[PDB]
């Protein structure tokens, strides 16, 4: 199915995923399309930061849902 | 300026600009305590190269209070105690996680502007605005300096 990820930038990407995909799977998909290391990624939905181990379905995240991608910035 | 609250007390925004157009940049050492030097710069009078030690202490008490519930501490995956031992080491990098905890601990707003030589985004900890906030510059993906709003604003 399809969901959208809005990057820090505000860039809006599409992702092909299953409800059974883990938040971790999703982060590796994001790394594949946009080149962002997963350990830098915070995916947020409905005011909650989403846990790597859980699935899109564990989160009741349906088709064409939009996630926010906030980065961890170190220096 | 358009801020969206993605999680409680955390806001994101997407303006594009050169940093030199709105801010003076006050460069900070490369030692790499820069995140702490940058906060000292903007919050501590008589700030010198040793002032950061005190922000590291406010960071240590902030963590004792907020670390275990910070969303971003889940990407760190250290116990509160291991985090502390690492964070208090000399040269240890600060980040958006310390900005979130210091915002609460110091009752301030901190904004980190990251630059992809221009500005790609900002992340804001706390409810205040660019004028009353502590403004940090994140550059090269690996470095912080302080910013001061230019005189005419």
From Swiss-Prot, chain A:
Record-annotated site: Interacts with activating enzyme: 54, 72
Record location of the Glycyl lysine isopeptide (Lys-Gly) (interchain with G-Cter in ubiquitin) cross-link: 6, 11, 27, 29, 33, 48, 63
Source taxon at top rank: Eukaryota
Entire-sequence positions represented here: 1 to 75 of 229
Residue intervals of the Ubiquitin-like domain: 1-75
Modified sites of kind Phosphoserine: 65
Annotated compartments: Cytoplasm; Nucleus; Mitochondrion outer membrane
Disulfide bridges in this chain: none
Outcome when changing residue 63 to R: Abolishes HLTF-mediated polyubiquitination of PCNA
Protein name per the record: Ubiquitin
Annotated consequence of substituting residue 65 to A: Prevents phosphorylation in case of mitophagy. Decreased localization of PRKN to mitochondria
Site feature (Essential for function) residues: 68
Modified-residue entries ((Microbial infection) ADP-ribosylthreonine), positions: 66
Membrane topology recorded in Swiss-Prot or TrEMBL: Peripheral membrane protein
Lineage, broadest ranks: Eukaryota, Metazoa, Chordata, Craniata, Vertebrata
Gene: UBB
Record PTM text: Phosphorylated at Ser-65 by PINK1 during mitophagy. Phosphorylated ubiquitin specifically binds and activates parkin (PRKN), triggering mitophagy. Phosphorylation does not affect E1-mediated E2 charging of ubiquitin but affects discharging of E2 enzymes to form polyubiquitin chains. It also affects deubiquitination by deubiquitinase enzymes such as USP30. Mono-ADP-ribosylated at the C-terminus by PARP9, a component of the PPAR9-DTX3L complex. ADP-ribosylation requires processing by E1 and E2 enzymes and prevents ubiquitin conjugation to substrates such as histones.
Effect of substituting residue 48 to R: No effect on HLTF-mediated polyubiquitination of PCNA
Effect noted on mutating residue 65 to E: Phosphomimetic mutant that binds and activates PRKN
Function: Exists either covalently attached to another protein, or free (unanchored). When covalently bound, it is conjugated to target proteins via an isopeptide bond either as a monomer (monoubiquitin), a polymer linked via different Lys residues of the ubiquitin (polyubiquitin chains) or a linear polymer linked via the initiator Met of the ubiquitin (linear polyubiquitin chains).
Organism of derivation: Homo sapiens (Human)
Swiss-Prot record, chain B:
Consequence recorded when altering residue 145 to A: 40-fold loss of proteolytic activity
Reported impact of residue 143 to A: Loss of deubiquitinating and deISGylase activities
Organism: Crimean-Congo hemorrhagic fever virus (strain Nigeria/IbAr10200/1970)
Free-text domain note: The viral OTU domain (vOTU) and its N-terminal extension is responsible for ubiquitin and ISG15 binding and for the deubiquitination and deISGylation activities.
Family indicated by similarity: Belongs to the Bunyavirales RNA polymerase family.
Role noted for this protein: Displays RNA-directed RNA polymerase, deubiquitinating and deISGylase activities. RNA-dependent RNA polymerase is responsible for replication and transcription of the viral RNA genome. During transcription, synthesizes subgenomic RNAs and assures their capping by a cap-snatching mechanism, which involves the endonuclease activity cleaving the host capped pre-mRNAs. These short capped RNAs are then used as primers for viral transcription.
Protein name per its UniProtKB record: RNA-directed RNA polymerase L
Active site per database record: 34, 143, 145
Further details from the record: Classified as His(+) endonuclease since it has a histidine upstream of the active site that coordinates the first cation.
Domain OTU stretches: 23-150
Essential for the vOTU enzymatic activity as annotated region, ranges: 1-22
UniProt effect for mutating residue 34 to A: Almost complete loss of OTU proteolytic activity. Unable to block RIG-I-mediated gene activation
Subunit structure: Interacts (via N-terminus) with host ISG15 (via C-terminus); the deISGylase activity of the viral protein interferes with antiviral signaling pathways mediated by NF-kappaB and IRF signalings. Interacts with host ubiquitin.
Lineage, uppermost ranks: Viruses, Riboviria, Orthornavirae, Negarnaviricota, Polyploviricotina
Effect in UniProt of substituting residue 10 to R: Complete loss of debubiquitination activity. No effect on deISGylation. Unable to block RIG-I-mediated gene activation
Gene symbol of the encoding locus: L
Result of changing residue 143 to A: 350-fold loss of proteolytic activity
Effect of residue 121 to R: Complete loss of deISGylation and debubiquitination activities. Unable to block RIG-I-mediated gene activation
Residues of the full protein shown: 7 to 161 of 3945
């Amino acid at each position: 199915m399809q969901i959208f990820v809005k990057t820090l930038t505000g860039k809006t990407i599409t992702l092909e995923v299953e409800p059974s995909d883990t938040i971790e799977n999703v982060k590796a998909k994001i790394q594949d399309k946009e080149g962002i290391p997963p350990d830098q990624q915070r995916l947020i939905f409905a005011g909650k930061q989403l846990e790597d181990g859980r699935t899109l379905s564990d989160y009741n995240i349906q088709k064409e849902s939009t996630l926010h991608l906030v980065l961890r910035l170190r220096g | 300026l358009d801020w969206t609250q993605v999680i409680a007390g955390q806001y994101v925004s997407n303006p594009r600009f050169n940093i030199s157009d709105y801010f003076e940049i006050v460069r900070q050492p490369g030692d790499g305590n820069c995140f702490y030097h940058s906060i000292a710069e903007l919050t501590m009078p008589n700030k010198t190269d040793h002032s950061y030690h005190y922000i590291k202490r406010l960071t240590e008490s902030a963590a004792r209070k907020y670390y275990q519930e910070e969303p971003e501490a889940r990407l760190v995956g250290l116990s509160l105690e291991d985090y502390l031992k690492r964070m208090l080491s000399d040269n240890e990098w600060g980040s958006t996680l310390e900005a979130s905890m210091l915002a609460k601990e110091m009752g301030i707003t901190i904004i980190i502007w990251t630059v992809a030589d221009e500005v790609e985004a900002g992340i804001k900890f706390g409810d205040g605005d660019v004028f009353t906030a502590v403004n940090l510059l994140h550059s090269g993906q690996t470095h912080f300096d302080a910013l001061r709003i230019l005189p005419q604003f």
